[PDB]
Amino acid sequence: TPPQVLAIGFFLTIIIGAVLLMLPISTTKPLSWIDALFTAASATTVTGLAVVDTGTQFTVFGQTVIMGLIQIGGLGFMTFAVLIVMILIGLVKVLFLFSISIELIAALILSIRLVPQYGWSSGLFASLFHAISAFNNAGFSLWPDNLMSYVGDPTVNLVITFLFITGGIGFTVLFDVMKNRRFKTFSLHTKLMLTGTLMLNAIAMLTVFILEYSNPGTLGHLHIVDKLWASYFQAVTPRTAGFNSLDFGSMREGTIVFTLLLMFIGAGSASTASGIKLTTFIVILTSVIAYLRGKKETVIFRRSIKYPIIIKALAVSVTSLFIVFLGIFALTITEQAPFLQIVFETFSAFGTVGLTMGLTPELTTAGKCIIIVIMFIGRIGPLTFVFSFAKTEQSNIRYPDGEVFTG
Amino acid sequence: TPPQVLAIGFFLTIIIGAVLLMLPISTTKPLSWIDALFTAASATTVTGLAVVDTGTQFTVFGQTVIMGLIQIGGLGFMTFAVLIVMILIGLVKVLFLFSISIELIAALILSIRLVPQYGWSSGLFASLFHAISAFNNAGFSLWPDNLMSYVGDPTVNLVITFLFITGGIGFTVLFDVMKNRRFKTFSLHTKLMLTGTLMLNAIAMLTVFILEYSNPGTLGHLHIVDKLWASYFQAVTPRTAGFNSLDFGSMREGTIVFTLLLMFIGAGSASTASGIKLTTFIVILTSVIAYLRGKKETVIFRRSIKYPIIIKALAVSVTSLFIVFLGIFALTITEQAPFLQIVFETFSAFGTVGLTMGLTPELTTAGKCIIIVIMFIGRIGPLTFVFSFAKTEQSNIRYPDGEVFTG
Amino acid sequence: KQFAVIGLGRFGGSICKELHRMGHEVLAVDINEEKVNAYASYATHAVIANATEENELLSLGIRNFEYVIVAIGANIQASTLTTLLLKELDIPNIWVKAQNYYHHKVLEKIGADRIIHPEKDMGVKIAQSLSDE
Amino acid sequence: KQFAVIGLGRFGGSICKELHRMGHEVLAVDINEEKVNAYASYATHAVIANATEENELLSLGIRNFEYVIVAIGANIQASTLTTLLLKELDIPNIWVKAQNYYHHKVLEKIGADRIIHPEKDMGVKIAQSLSDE
Ligand SMILES: Nc1ncnc2c1ncn2[C@@H]1O[C@H](COP(=O)(O)OP(=O)(O)O)[C@@H](O)[C@H]1O
Ligand SMILES: Nc1ncnc2c1ncn2[C@@H]1O[C@H](COP(=O)(O)OP(=O)(O)O)[C@@H](O)[C@H]1O
Ligand SMILES: [K+]
Ligand SMILES: [K+]
């Protein structure tokens, strides 16, 4: 029941949002039942995958509903994620005020750039919509091209990136930074996120820039300053915002393969991001290296990591891969699509990133249903979701040890 | 040094075998330097991937060299794998006599079928070559089509399958079965292999039969009895023999995806197979299920599995996936090939299976070099290989515990 | 065929090994993990459990076993408490190993079907062997 | 600025907390893991190690520290043995907490730079405060 409320709560939000888009006031053109369910699920379980363009399908009221689902879905999980961390509506109001304040000021900054181009009415809703979407790591865009026209605009790149970096790292990291303000006094988790994000983004930015430099489709016909912006944006968006500045369908396969790992590890723990978190990847990576070097314990940042943390990190990783493997297996049988797109779609759906290469619009009815399940499970979390619908019986009997060769 | 000898020993065998095929007596037509190195590496690190057809490239002397490398490579690792298990040339002779005896009688049975068709000289070398190849899980075939002409022949299917099932499970399992002969008295490891193999093969046979039943390319234009043989053969060959009876390039994508997991989990521990072994997959799967069900310990077959076994199983799995991920990433940049073939090639090379879909012949010079490294690392093992070339310093200092959120 | 031995010590371990040789299904339960591992191969089922807790006894399935032997030594309270719990589980036959005369009296009055005194009982049959020799 | 405190107890823990407040780098070493975890945030470096082993002392880098305070209590042999090892590491200043008069004499003769007797030394300054009051 403690983890079952979140699973039921998101289910109620999706169906309420799905039927809210059925009215002949949200969408100009008729929308199928599966697309509305997919759109509501992507907005609630904040992923960003779209089978229909937001601008050309929904009206101002419809886009407001999408904005509401993103804010409710992003904040609903974020508040519960913080509560789960501290346990394992006084606090909700504090997070709501913080989220609204940072999104409001970001919209005002974005308004300086958008309202001179789209107008007072169009430019203010677009700035607010992108401020809400970016902070909650959604990736939804009103424009038909997802931020592809603002590849070289510093105002769009800097403000939006700051939103899903601040909202990507956990709220514990944000609290610890402002409470302590000294790196020596930060917690171990806070030091893992701050150091890990800088290292991971730098490696990702270098990889995208080098591989896509000679690609004519993306990063090739751009100025040297614009190449840096696009490489910087495409390195931080896979985890987990899923905003675009280049066409992922025209990228090199090597960049896509590296993006698969980039969007499977996600970001911060108690935040709007999803996917094995960054700390989980670091804990596993350092634990294995310590074993290879013969170290009896995993030591990082002058601290120690206990076995229950190690096994939990390894348990969520293998469980996540098994779910992704099932999704790829299910989609290959159902969808007659190239394998690389299917793999990219499944990792993006599970990590709630929303990046795609020409596959989400062309999914079949059965294919969309699989993605919705993958998005829902990935957002909730493989460990949290199972506990909701699994019989629990604490064992009290030990057994003799057995020798198993795992070489 | 204890694990470094095996890494150096296989390196010496490959280069000796590579230069042995350079003489103008082994191959009828000239062979490039990279192909000879690839052929020697595939034969020594017993995988079965071939850039050139064995029958149409090498002569009787050349095929004898390949037969020698398979026997030396398969037995060289098998003897050391048994020694590693018992530690963590009296025994070598016992294994050599057992391996020769079972291969010799199998060749005699195969001779009843092959020499009436190919002749006394041709049919006896072919039967001996396939008996050696099958027992050591090689997959090499003298014929241009790898066992594709014997899809419905019970003599070829039964004898060859028995060879890489007996040689696939660990030699400890073989010893325990004949020493005890009662399932109640078998060890925990022996009961995992015997029960796991029957369950895994049955699931694989059902999956291949159902998915490929309507495929015109494979399993479609065959008699109902021949469908059972091909489905049975294609379910047991991925781990790890890599023999063929149907064209994997014309199979459904769903069958290929399931084969990726099938040839990643490989087979038994101290044997001729490679890959995370079965017990490792079972240990991880049961450990995660116990955690999800709230069990304080992993219990299977009325026994208990300790944490060092759990972490070692999880450490080798994540390390193996990271190496496979690097191989796929390296091949995508180097080889301009469809992604599904690249993934299938990397899993097959790492698991030393040798199954391929029209990619091994068309690999570039740089692509072949990557596969050789992948085959060598997979055969040695990620944990064994690292210990050979890693500085070791046993730590004697503990550190205060740190809290890391891995949700 | 259906026997359970509680406490894998010098006396309890000898019963499991001898019964296993004769071809009988024996359940061995002991708090110490080293004892259970040592006798894991000598018993059909080996369990690491505490016999003084009634919740663990039901998990093992002691009520199924017709014969239960309580061979707990050096811990008289555990031996006395275990046999008292077994009578609540309506075990037909309960054989208990006694430590001294006072422990023998307590076990007799709490409903032990048969009380075993290995040091004293061996003397009365060694002496019998002397007369027959 | 460079201080090391060995033994995180009532006396040793108070030194680490007070030095940390003043803004000094303090290394805390203790065998008990609970003590090190409790004082992990109150020390620049917290280490779970045994001070009686000369191999572990070199790993920490005690020779770098100019001031080392041995605040081991209730284990006189560990306190005496630790200070004897520190003199082999040519530590300039070693401050040791004594337990009784006999322990005070032993520490003085084995080369302790300053010997602290918290119960006795506090009395001679409480009495001084009474006269000044
Ligand atoms: N509460 C208990 N439940 C189950 N087994 C117990 C309990 N207390 C003690 N034992 C086991 O009973 C055994 C008694 O052995 P010991 O005291 O050496 O004398 P003996 O070998 O003659 O029985 C110990 O090995 C111990 O593991
Ligand atoms: N060999 C040792 N090395 C390091 N620390 C030790 C060693 N032996 C004891 N200690 C620590 O010294 C501390 C002494 O505390 P205690 O005996 O309560 O008196 P006090 O608090 O007055 O020092 C203990 O908390 C213990 O953890
Ligand atoms: K997203
Ligand atoms: K093979």
Numbering used by the authors:
A (entry chain I), B (entry chain J): 15 to 102, 127 to 445
C (entry chain F), D (entry chain D): 7 to 139
According to the publication:
We also solved the cryo-EM structure of ADP-BsKtrAB at the resolution 2.8 Å (Structure III). First, ADP binding to BsKtrA results in opening of the intra-dimer interface, as observed in the previous study, making Na+ binding at this site unfavorable. The conformational change at the intra-dimer interface causes a dimer-to-dimer rotation, rendering the square- and diamond-shaped octameric rings. In the ADP-BsKtrAB structure, the long axis of the diamond-shaped ADP-BsKtrA octameric ring provides the space to accommodate the elongated D1M2b helices of the two BsKtrB protomers, although the density of the very C-terminal end of D1M2b helix (Gly103 to Gly124) is poor, likely due to high flexibility in this region. On the other hand, the side chain of BsKtrB Arg417, which was speculated to be a gating residue in the middle of D4M2 helix forms a hydrogen bond with the carbonyl oxygen of Thr310 in the intramembrane loop of ADP-BsKtrAB, providing a positively charged barrier that obstructs the passage of K+ ions. In the ADP-BsKtrAB state, due to the fully extended and continuous helix conformation, Gly87 backbone oxygen is engaged in an intrahelical hydrogen bonding in D1M2 helix, hampering the polar interaction with Arg417. Notably, in ADP-BsKtrAB, the phenyl ring of Phe91 in D1M2b points toward the pore directly below the hydrogen bond between Arg417 and Thr310, serving as a hydrophobic gate. Arg417 and Phe91 form the narrowest region in the pore at the ADP-bound state, and this region is widened at the ATP-bound state, suggesting that these two residues play a pivotal role in the gating mechanism of BsKtrB in response to the ligand-induced conformation changes of BsKtrA octameric ring. The pore radius analysis reveals the most constricted point near the intramembrane loop in the ADP-bound state. ADP-binding to BsKtrA induces a diamond-shaped ring, providing adequate space to allow D1M2b helix to be fully extended and thus restricting the pore.
The K+ uptake system KtrAB is essential for bacterial survival in low K+ environments. The activity of KtrAB is regulated by nucleotides and Na+. The KtrAB system is composed of the transmembrane KtrB dimer, each containing four structurally similar domains (D1~D4) arranged around a four-fold pseudosymmetry axis normal to the cell membrane, and the regulatory KtrA octamer (tetramer of homodimer) with a ring-like structure, known as the RCK gating ring. ATP binding to KtrA octamer activates K+ flux activity of KtrB, whereas ADP binding inactivates it.
